[PDB]
Swiss-Prot record, chains A, B:
Protein encoded by which gene: frdA
Membrane-spanning intervals of the chain: none
Localization terms from the record: Cell inner membrane
Phenotype for residue 301 to E: No growth on fumarate, loss of FAD cofactor, no enzyme activity
A single BP term in Gene Ontology: electron transport chain
EC numbers: 1.3.5.1
Keywords: Cell inner membrane, Cell membrane, Electron transport, FAD, Flavoprotein, Membrane, Oxidoreductase, Respiratory chain, Transport
Its membrane topology: Peripheral membrane protein
The protein's name: Fumarate reductase flavoprotein subunit
Annotated binding of FAD, by residue: 13-16, 42-44, 49-50, 235, 393, 409-410
Catalytic activity: a quinone + succinate = fumarate + a quinol
Active site: 257, 273
Superkingdom of origin: Bacteria
């Protein structure tokens, strides 16, 4: 038997995984990072919008602080997030930027002077003072009133990921790629590591550690149309769910982006709309104003996506051999504006769409983008399965609720990596584990048996046809608009698809470098993941954040101010087991109210919200009058935790 | 923390270790072999006499079989061996040769014809039939009547070791050299591996396995004069003794060789005496006939060594700046006889003694050669500490008793490696282990602390002066002739030397590649080992095999037909704890009698020997008359065990 031991095992080499690996290595814990591919190729590298953090450096950032950021995040989540976690987040975000800055991340800087700026509420000019010069800049992104999205030109994710990966190399972390975690080792409700398959040799190896962290990214590829990389299939989520102990949180909370290139799904940054981009239909008609006379194509993403789907349903969509789409017209911004400010958008359309965005229109359509759902954890990042932690998009640390804020996901990866990294490091150093060879042997022989059975199956089903059918079902039934009747149809079919997936047969019989065999065990996992999203989408009879139930348009704060928890305790069952974790309003710093975007009074008000609201107004006013800083007031409304290391306040310009 | 896991951990890369490694790897057990130096440089490579095995191929081998070999071994052991183990041995020896033969070991072959041969009972000519041609040859060695010592010209150990090492490479065994086991990991009386120090980096690493085998060789370097390599310091033995659970068997049973080159200790093969070599004193007087008129310089080694020491004591020894020695005259054999039959002895004397053995006399003196003692095990090779096995010279499997047979030690290494290898393999595959990080951490941090303390000691003692003093004490008091008064003096001084060894201070402070630090922790181990030999030599008031007590000249079969068992249960004690394992005559296939060499009736007869002897004569005659093969008779006298794989009988020429 092959066994590898390390104090801290990290599954996932993206921003969250690598940063967490830094936190454990820097304090003497031997740590291994497992990854499907070279770590600096993770989906994190694709980020081009930026990272949200309240620095308050630039003119449009002036006045910004933890409180403002915190609020956008909570109201953005539609109150489905753990506000305490959101506080831990907003507070540490500033120092994540600065640390990355200290590590070489080439953040775009501010320079004294006036500049051409688009506010589309006034496409006026902005002035940056001299004392702001040389500090980290920010851009308008995510719809926040305060511009706090930091960026490194148009390759933010790229540079960020490279810095963290390089720190890992500097600290001597063990990066092992082309290695896939296919199962978690656990006994008596504690995680002891993972059974891993070497994608090249095909060897099944047991990786044991005192603590295991899953930072496997999103499960976006369970949809046919998605912005995600081809490696975001949620298997990380799956192996956690397959322990029968750990739980998945809000898997039905999937977020879509409105303007990905159709049909490839290659992202066309939000800056297109923000700078003036125009959405047109089959007739070339600018339709957003029709639906949103005020904000027009500058409405919140959530809205735009819905409108685009509505318009298409009204039969005004473009007919294409890959389906219906709409048009994105950026040409009206001028050629000089594109070749300098959107020089990267011009390359995307040429290389992949075969068009010049300054001369032609780009085919677009909303598609799956971010996964709010994930392995459920406490504020420390630990799952119900002791010793198993999760961070980043793969988790449901839950600071996103039902709508993650644009710019908050890459931010969360690094931040959670820092905070969970600490808690994880502490767990590993302090906990003492009892490793039984009998158990290691059970899990390793177990997966060897499984691989063998796959290679020997005489089943007649095709893994690809099964996989493709799954992504169609998800796209057609679990997208932007959902209704009970269709969800039931989807759940039923996904469950049937799951059963047939076990009668798959593959042509290639080898155990090493076998892409066909990879699909063989992955698709079944992807199906169990899809079932949690679909079935959870069916059972949640309300419309919250990204979850829109046509048959239940109003957000139900009475019966649904909770969190969906999925599990699969019985390996023989064919549908996920759902439970709910109620969000206690009494622990909220901000009581459930209007979110800012969309219809109004579109929510069944909960009576305890009102009571709590007063409690808030009361306590706030008494201290606010008694001469008290925003800090003391915050502590009085909702005290949160933070590792000692990140407890410090964030110095800002104008302090 | 650094942890390496394998199913089967082997400490020692000599014949016994490597062969055992083959046995576990060939059956799918991942196995690691740890060694101080490259495995093919082990002391095993030095063997030039040959390997004893009853093939019965050659003329002088004709008639040979398991029974004859078995008897030489038991009577040779002076009845201190486990006869059942000796049976397991003699039976498997033949197949060890043949397997090595199948592996390429270039065994010298037989060729039809007559040849010049020396029997010194008749220096006549020998004839090898045509049906013997091409089969494995044998030579006169070990004093056995039947010539059964197989050899590969004059580098038997060399070729044998290379074949086994190469098989290890072929099977993909993990050979990790410049790695030293400095402590054994154990909890609840079970061995889980070993704490290892990387001699190059200085890293302390924990090697965990389901089974650990110690095949570390002999502890000969605790003497000043020894044939052993500089790496035979018994640390393997020490780490076993330091667990407080495992026991050492007959550590006082040390064997000496009579003709090593003085003072280097470089061996001058027994073929010198056998071919005609003459022993002379300071006056050039051939003295052996004086003491042994019959056998003369052809008496058993045991005798020759004693005579040489007696003669020296009588003041007839040569005075040299390194002490007193005697002379070995091979010149009288002629120049042509040496340059063809002893061409290798001629090189030894020139390169190291600066003399031509065909023109001058070589300075000689008896010196420590083989260690019968070692980690005590059952017939399967397992120690009192479960999961810990031992094989080869490092063990006390006990087939040697108080006098190992010349040609039986390299034979035992490979044989035990095969048999213990099987039992070891079975243990590893079947047993299930519970590895607690708390324990691994205790032992690893424990040895790190120790190294650190060594490097920081302000002690003023010198490790080398302490080490050298130890080897003098052993040479002067625990050699060929021993008496109570002197042994008490030695024990007392060794115990004082041990205490001062803990106040050692070393100049070089680094933790990597530090030969001074190596001596720092090794010498203390060597001292605990010496104490077991010395103190066990003091408490055994009798003269048996290599153990000669002048004050107790007779072999006591009444009070000493037992085995010395040394332990060190309390880390605070300063002297080994001895106990005795009684040898049950009722389980002996051969009752205690005369050994063949030396004085006669020199043993306090045990009454149960006689009773048993009849039981033997009776049972033998009844079956011998009732028409029964030597096999059925053996089974009736003393049934022994053998792994299924080696249960087959040994086909011989003339069957
Ligand atoms: C898709 C996307 C997302 C995105 C974005 C643009 C695109 C095209 N732009 C963003 C932006 O401007 N601002 C922002 O805040 N977020 C943006 N996002 C979303 C964001 O990039 C993600 O939320 C974030 O990158 C998630 O980071 P995370 O560290 O969690 O994950 P990852 O980078 O995907 O890496 C996952 C790693 O896991 C390994 N893996 C996965 N499964 C396994 C298994 N089974 N075994 C072993 N390793 C596994 C992957 O190899 C990978 O390295
Ligand atoms: C010294 C000697 C012995 C000898 C002989 C000639 C000489 C000069 N000629 C012989 C002969 O002709 N016929 C015969 O039957 N025996 C003869 N012998 C004795 C024989 O060679 C030995 O009994 C035999 O070789 C012992 O084999 P074994 O496999 O037990 O041991 P080894 O070869 O010495 O190797 C020991 C290995 O252990 C490693 N080691 C030791 N301590 C440690 C620690 N603490 N940690 C890690 N590794 C360790 C050594 O590196 C070595 O590889
Ligand atoms: Na998530
Ligand atoms: Na021994």
């Amino acid at each position: 038997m092959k066994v590898q031991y390390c104090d801290s095992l990290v599954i996932g080499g993206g921003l969250a995984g690598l940063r967490a690996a830094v936190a454990t290595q820097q304090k003497g814990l031997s740590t291994i990072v497992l990854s499907l591919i070279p770590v600096k190729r993770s989906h994190s590298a694709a980020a081009q919008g930026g990272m949200q953090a309240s620095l308050g450096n630039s003119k449009m950032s002036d006045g910004d602080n933890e409180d403002l950021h915190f609020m956008d995040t909570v109201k953005g989540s539609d109150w489905g997030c753990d506000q305490k976690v959101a506080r831990m987040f907003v507070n540490t975000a500033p120092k994540a930027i600065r640390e990355l800055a200290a590590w070489g991340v080439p953040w775009t800087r501010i320079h004294k002077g006036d500049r051409m700026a688009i506010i589309n509420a006034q496409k006026t000019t902005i002035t940056e003072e001299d004392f702001r010069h040389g500090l980290i800049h920010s851009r308008d992104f995510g719809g926040t009133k305060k511009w706090r999205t930091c960026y490194t030109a148009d390759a933010t994710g790229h540079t960020m990921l490279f810095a963290v990966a390089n720190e890992c190399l500097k600290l001597g972390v063990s990066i092992q790629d082309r290695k896939e975690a296919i199962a978690l080792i656990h006994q008596d409700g504690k995680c002891y590591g993972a059974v891993v398959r070497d994608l090249v040799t095909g060897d099944i190896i047991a990786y044991v550690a005192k603590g295991t962290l899953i930072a496997t990214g999103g499960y976006g590829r369970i949809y046919k149309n998605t912005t995600n990389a081809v490696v975001c299939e949620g298997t990380g989520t799956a192996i956690a769910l397959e322990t029968g102990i750990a739980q998945l949180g809000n898997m039905e909370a999937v977020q879509f982006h409105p303007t990905p290139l159709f049909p490839s799904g290659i992202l066309l940054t939000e800056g297109c709309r923000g700078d003036g981009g125009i959405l047109r239909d089959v007739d070339g008609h600018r339709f957003m104003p029709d639906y949103e006379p005020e904000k027009k194509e500058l409405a919140s993403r959530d809205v735009v996506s819905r409108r685009m789907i509505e318009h298409i349903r009204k039969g005004k969509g473009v007919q294409s051999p890959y389906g219906q789409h709409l048009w994105l017209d950026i040409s009206i911004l001028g050629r000089k504006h594109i070749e300098t400010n959107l020089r990267d958008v011009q390359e995307i359309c040429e290389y992949f769409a075969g068009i010049d965005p300054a001369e032609k229109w780009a085919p677009v359509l909303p598609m799956q983008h971010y996964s709010m759902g994930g392995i459920r954890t406490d504020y420390r990042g630990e799952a119900k399965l002791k010793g198993l932690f999760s961070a980043g998009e793969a988790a449901c640390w839950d600071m996103h609720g039902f709508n993650r804020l644009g710019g908050n996901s890459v931010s969360e990866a690094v931040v959670a990596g820092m905070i969970v990294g600490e808690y994880f490091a502490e767990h590993c150093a302090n906990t003492q584990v009892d490793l039984e060879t009998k158990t290691l042997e059970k899990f390793v022989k177990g997966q060897e048996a499984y691989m063998k059975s796959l290679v020997e199956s005489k089943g007649t089903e095709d893994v690809f046809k099964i996989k493709n059918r799954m992504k169609d079902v998800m796209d057609d039934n679990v997208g932007i608009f959902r209704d009970g009747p269709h969800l039931e149809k989807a759940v039923k079919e996904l469950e049937e698809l799951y059963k047939k997936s076990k009668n798959v047969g593959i042509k290639n019989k080898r155990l090493h470098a076998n892409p066909e065999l990879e699909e063989a065990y992955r698709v079944p996992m992807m199906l169990k993941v899809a079932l949690c999203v679909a079935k959870g989408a069916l059972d949640r009879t309300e419309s919250r954040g990204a979850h829109n139930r046509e048959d239940y348009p109003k957000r139900d704060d009475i019966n649904w101010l909770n969190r969906t928890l999925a599990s699969w305790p019985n390996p023989e069952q064919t549908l996920p087991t759902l439970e709910y974790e109620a969000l206690d309003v009494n622990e909220m710093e901000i009581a459930p109210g209007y979110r800012g975007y969309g219809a109004k009074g579109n929510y069944i008000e909960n009576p305890l919200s009102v009571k709590r609201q007063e409690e808030i107004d009361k306590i706030q006013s008494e201290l606010e009058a008694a001469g008290k800083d925003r800090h003391a007031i915050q502590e009085a409304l909702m005290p949160y935790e933070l590792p000692a290391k990140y407890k410090a306040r964030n110095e800002r310009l104008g302090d």
